Amino acid sequence: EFIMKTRMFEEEGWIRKKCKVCGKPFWTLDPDRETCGDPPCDEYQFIGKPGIPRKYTLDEMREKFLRFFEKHEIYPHGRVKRYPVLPRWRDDVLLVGASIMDFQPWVISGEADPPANPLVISQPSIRFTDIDNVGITGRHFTIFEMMAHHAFNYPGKPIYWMDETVELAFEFFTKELKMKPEDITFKENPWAGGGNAGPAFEVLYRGLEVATLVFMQYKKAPENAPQDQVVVIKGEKYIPMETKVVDTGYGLERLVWMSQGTPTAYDAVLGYVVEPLKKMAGIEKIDEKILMENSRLAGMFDIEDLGDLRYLREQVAKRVGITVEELEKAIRPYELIYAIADHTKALTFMLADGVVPSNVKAGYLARLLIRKSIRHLRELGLEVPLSEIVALHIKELHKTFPEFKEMEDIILEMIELEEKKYAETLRRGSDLVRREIAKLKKKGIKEIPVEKLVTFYESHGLTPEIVKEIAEKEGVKVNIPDNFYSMVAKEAERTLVDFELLKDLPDTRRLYYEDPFMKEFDAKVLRVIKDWVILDATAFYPEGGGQPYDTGVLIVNGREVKVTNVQKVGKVIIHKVEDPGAFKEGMIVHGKIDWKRRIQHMRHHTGTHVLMGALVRVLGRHVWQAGSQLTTDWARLDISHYKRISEEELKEIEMLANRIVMEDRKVTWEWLPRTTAEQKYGFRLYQGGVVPGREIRVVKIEDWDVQACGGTHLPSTGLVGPIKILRTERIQDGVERIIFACGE
Ligand SMILES: [Zn+2]
């Protein structure tokens, strides 16, 4: 269905074939190749025999890639600093799972400018879909770096496309990495990621997929899309888009593994943790071919799709010449070490980038990794705090990722607190599940359902091997599924008046953006739906961003009519009035805002921002808004935070906030293109979540705080008056609330 002929293929003698095993199309220079180069059609050929002629570390390979694209003489790329693994710019995914997620939805739609075009990036990426594979297959990670060159071809502005992408890829592999040209295949296989899809190549070499080259030209299909949708790859329905995006992904770890030829990718990437762990646990060397064969055979073996690891192990057992029991005995301590090594690295990135362990979203996933790793350490017989293993990653990685050093105290404390609380969680959970298990076998069935085992973790915090040893006392039957953690992880993703009657009306001019001190204005009545009056312009603030609506009056024919509620539907502002019959279309009215109410809201709104700057400085840079609500008399600010705020801390925060009020710092706002705002201020802009639009309204307190914000603010901090913190309290794991009052 997709034509993927290129200039390079045509000019350089590449032959399109159909793989004799999987039937997929692939391109090769090798006249005797009949298979695509992808397991199980081909096998890993580089283990014990590096396919790249010189060895590379992570730092070397990453820089090799970045520099190649950056300094390219024909297609120079702008080097872009990696994004946090927490996608502050979007509300639809939990974690960055690919480099392209940095540029969705805003860059791809054309709502944001690309940071550079074309660009090159090495993006730390996290995926939980293969978590049970980690340590088991020799190749799977939860945390990895996807190196990428991206080009955003908006209509009318071509950058580069399919021809140049295959050439750049081939040039990097053959000229920079000295890989054998005829061993490289381009397998046609459509791809998708984070809302978009298109035709793609898998670039295969010595049995390993070393890159994916995706030509994104489709977007997630809207509900009830007509005749021509295209079904691709996982997600089904898509429709064409005008913008064509080059979406590449080169696995840093895989390329390093290709250069090392070690039994597992973990030995090539995580030796600095794997080897101390071996030594600490006193794990003796085992037969090297056990690891090698397992990795090789695992190339052909998925487990997250079918529960057949048992057969992978029967295969590697026969190959090695031992039984499955003695195989399990030998390899198990290594699987445990590999998982610990990987999980502690994932956590280093996650917590450094602002993930707070909790029972929700990405915090839920961090907590999952922490608990799994602690349980792995116990099975190894290793009595070491997890924070000590996390510390080994900070030590190794902080020179490339300075943020790890800067956040180290907080990262290690978060790990320590999670561990020390988990011991408590495990006592209470063990009894509650013992009672439930005893009650289930008392009257009903003595079998543990897979869903109840999932419920056991995410309700009582206990891992399935703990459940089974309590259960096999009375009321037996374990059956821990091979994909237990993959299923537990997927749990983290668990999810005024009318319209079309105001689609025809133009945008309400927002006079409150023109002057926050405007309290009176004249305007024309455009529409009266029920008791909602729509004006062409208004100084009435519509409820949003934690700030309640303005109230006041509209004066019509001398008569005063109360405005009791103000909302926004799309871009049209609606005013609730006590006497709608008084208002007719075309009528010009005088508006009067309840000023006491407005100014009290403004004091708490700007005061919230003053407080935010104080919170970040006292508590740490993981502090981020989880929620906000203002009233006339008080405000609340909810923040992601990992412990109770002590009374002394509260006073430190209060002193700092009031110091800034006393300094009377300027508070300013302006509209900026979103990528321009992001590159200048960072992702801290997105406190209240992510705001749509080509341009975002940025509210800045000089040298203190900056947020994308649509509220009414005071022009200086002195006008807030005293800030008095009344209360701190926990809302849930990972969320602390501060209640405060602003003004004399
Ligand atoms: Zn094939």
From Swiss-Prot:
Entry binding sites for Zn(2+): H605, H609, C709
Cofactor note as given: Binds 1 zinc ion per subunit.
One term under GO cellular component: cytoplasm
Source organism per UniProt: Pyrococcus horikoshii (strain ATCC 700860 / DSM 12428 / JCM 9974 / NBRC 100139 / OT-3)
Catalytic activity: tRNA(Ala) + L-alanine + ATP = L-alanyl-tRNA(Ala) + AMP + diphosphate
Chief subcellular location: cytoplasm
Role played: Catalyzes the attachment of alanine to tRNA(Ala) in a two-step reaction: alanine is first activated by ATP to form Ala-AMP and then transferred to the acceptor end of tRNA(Ala). Edits incorrectly charged Ser-tRNA(Ala). Incorrectly charged amino acids occur because the of inherent physicochemical limitations on discrimination between closely related amino acids (Gly and Ser) in the charging step.
UniProt enzyme class: ligase
Family affiliation: Belongs to the class-II aminoacyl-tRNA synthetase family.
Entry EC number(s): 6.1.1.7
GO biological process: alanyl-tRNA aminoacylation
Protein name, per record: Alanine--tRNA ligase
GO terms for MF: alanine-tRNA ligase activity; aminoacyl-tRNA deacylase activity; ATP binding; tRNA binding; zinc ion binding
Reported cofactor(s): Zn(2+)
Assembly mode: Homodimer.
Free-text comment on this protein's domains from its UniProt entry: Consists of three domains; the N-terminal catalytic domain, the editing domain and the C-terminal C-Ala domain. The editing domain removes incorrectly charged amino acids, while the C-Ala domain, along with tRNA(Ala), serves as a bridge to cooperatively bring together the editing and aminoacylation centers thus stimulating deacylation of misacylated tRNAs.
UniProt keyword terms in alphabetical order: Aminoacyl-tRNA synthetase, ATP-binding, Cytoplasm, Ligase, Metal-binding, Nucleotide-binding, Protein biosynthesis, RNA-binding, tRNA-binding, Zinc
Subcellular location: Cytoplasm
